[model samples]
Target: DNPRELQVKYLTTYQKDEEKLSAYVLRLEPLLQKLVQRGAIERDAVNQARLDQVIAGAVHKTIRRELNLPEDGPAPGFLQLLVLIKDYEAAEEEEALLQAILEG
Candidate 1:
């Protein structure tokens, strides 16, 4: 398959709601590798490109709002972004648990 075509297909099909953020990002790894293998995107740019695509696709609004991510400006690296999302998910889960405890 054409690398660009494959990349677009994969990116368009990626759905954050279907999987955890970590798993969703992990699923893109093979597509990233394929793009690198085909020389569509350089190796050094993979992480940034992946981050851009994921963010563009539809990062949870809570993470974005909580982090105060700008409309256009510097942003954390891929791993840091993942950790942030993980932390947000954890906090949300804790909140829900506490609410359940209170309501129960």
Candidate 2:
């Protein structure tokens, strides 16, 4: 009878072990490299704030049709979740201080 259980049904699964966390971070490495290479964002200078901006843009572009929502409004909290995922990846990799600040 819990909505939390229902929500979990549709959410992506994650293992409590660090190995799985490492794998997820590895999977996202290419995406981060691509973002820098494409100049969609600056390399070695990403932070949570910058990631949030980029992700918010991507969400507006990609999810607009799926959610049937207007694309012109301000970014939503869900977009921040994407930034959190990116931050998690960065943390998993133990990036150096410079990289951390740039890629936060």
Candidate 3:
């Protein structure tokens, strides 16, 4: 593929509804590493690059809401974002589980 296609692919990628971020990373990492190896992305900026993409590309509305609140504040650390999003995910997952159990 051409350079623009390669770079742009990563930019537009988003998580699927059922995908956890860890699984999403497996797919995204290869695309990202290729960009880095080709010097399209500098090394230091890679962490925030991943964070930025995850926020903008988030699949869950709840997770996106959690991520979008950088208002008047600094962007979160990548790991901090990971921990915070997991709490939201856990809440949603447990809610689904409870609803399923209640109706059974």
Q: Pick the candidate with the highest TM-score.
A: 1
The predictions' CA RMSDs to the true structure, in order, are: 2.7, 15.9, 2.9
Tell me the tens digit of each residue's lDDT in model 2 across 26-93: 44445544555655555445443233333343323343343333445543343454455556557546
Total clashes for model 1: 0
Q: How close to the true structure is residue 52 of candidate 3, measured as C-alpha lDDT?
A: 69
Tens-digit per-residue lDDT, 1-104, candidate 1: 99889878767855466577667766776787788899888878776677666666655644456645655555566678778768866887899899999998
Q: Which portions of model 2 miss their true places by more than 4 Å?
A: 1-19, 47-104
lDDT of 3 by residue, 1-104 (tens): 76678789999998888888656755787787788888888878776677667766767545546545554455565567667667766877899999999999
Which parts of model 1 have CA positions greater than 4 angstroms off?
16-18, 59-62, 65-78
